[PDB]
Amino acid sequence: DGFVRTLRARPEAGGKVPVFVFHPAGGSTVVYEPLLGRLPADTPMYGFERVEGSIEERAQQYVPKLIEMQGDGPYVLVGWSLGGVLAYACAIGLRRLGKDVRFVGLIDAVRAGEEIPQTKEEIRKRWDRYAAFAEKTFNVPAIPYEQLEELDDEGQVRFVLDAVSQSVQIPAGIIEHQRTSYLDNRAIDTAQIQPYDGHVTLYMADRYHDDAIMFEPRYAVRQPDGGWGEYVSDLEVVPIGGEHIQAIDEPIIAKVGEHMSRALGQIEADRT
Numbered sequence: 001d002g003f004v005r006t007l008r009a010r011p012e013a014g015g016k017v018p019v020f021v022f023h024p025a026g027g028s029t030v031v032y033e034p035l036l037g038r039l040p041a042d043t044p045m046y047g048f049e050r051v052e053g054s055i056e057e058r059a060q061q062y063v064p065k066l067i068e069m070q071g072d073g074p075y076v077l078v079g080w081s082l083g084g085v086l087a088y089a090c091a092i093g094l095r096r097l098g099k100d101v102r103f104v105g106l107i108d109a110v111r112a113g114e115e116i117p118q119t120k121e122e123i124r125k126r127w128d129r130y131a132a133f134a135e136k137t138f139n140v141p142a143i144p145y146e147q148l149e150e151l152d153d154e155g156q157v158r159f160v161l162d163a164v165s166q167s168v169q170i171p172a173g174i175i176e177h178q179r180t181s182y183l184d185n186r187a188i189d190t191a192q193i194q195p196y197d198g199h200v201t202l203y204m205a206d207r208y209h210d211d212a213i214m215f216e217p218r219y220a221v222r223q224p225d226g227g228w229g230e231y232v233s234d235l236e237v238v239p240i241g242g243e244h245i246q247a248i249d250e251p252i253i254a255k256v257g258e259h260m261s262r263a264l265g266q267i268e269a270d271r272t
């Protein structure tokens with residue numbers, strides 16, 4: 001257990017190369033079950049669930065466990081949403097330690113069409129935007145920008161949540177789910193992408209959904225390479241259409257699965 005979920009266990013010895021999937025923003029790796037059904041028979045799959053920190057800090061926890069599980073390789077890393085960024089971060093980490101990474105699968109992990117500033121001004125604009133939505137959906141003051149600007153994202157939400165309780169009474173499970181979903185989404189926004197010299201496959205939908213765009217309008221635009229071209233020279237794009245939220249489910253996941261199954265077979269053949 002821990003932060004590793006077994007979706008399909010590998011046999012005691014040998015077997016096919018396992019697929020490592022990484023959780024999405026505000027979700028668990030159970031979302032990869034439809035993908036699992038579209039991969040070849042007896043393909044093992046292990047899901048890495050949420051841990052805390054920057055993307056690099058999260059990868060620092062994941063990579064040692066990956067090596068514990070798969071040693072030298074070969075590594076197949078896959079992720080939808082935040083999971084894609086996490087898969088990529090692990091690939092960089094693993095390659096840096098001399099491991100054999102043969103497949104990185106990004107399921108619509110698309111960068112915003114315009115870069116997202118990590119500035120104090122952007123912090124002010126973000127919470128101004130959030131406040132306005134809050135006014136409308138809850139039918140309800142000055143924003144203490146100076147205190148917010150000094151905090152990181154976790155500090156920011158903690159500050160806002162604390163201030164809210166001072167009336168206001170929100171059940172813990174709803175708060176915590178909104179909190180982790182928010183922070184996971186911000187982790188995508190603030191990811192500092194490093195270059196990777198291996199093969200990356202990007203399954204690309206048409207667009208982000210409306211709710212995502214409301215939160216950060218810069219996601220209203222996608223570049224053809226999904227923003228990965230400058231960091232990845234060996235990049236393949238597999239268009240799948242539909243929306244970001246649909247990309248992980250049937251029927252669209254069948255397209256992803258058919259393509260990905262072809263990649264896995266070549267890996268199994270090259271081993272033999």
Ligand SMILES: CCOC(=O)c1c(-c2ccccc2)oc2ccc(O)c(CN3CCOCC3)c12
Pocket residue numbers: 026177178181182183185186188189208211212213215216219
């Ligand atoms: C329902 C869609 O909500 C979100 O995507 C976001 C959420 C959120 C909040 C509560 C519950 C669920 C999600 O918080 C965000 C913070 C920044 C940000 O750019 C985004 C927009 N994202 C950023 C990453 O790329 C996809 C869109 C979000």
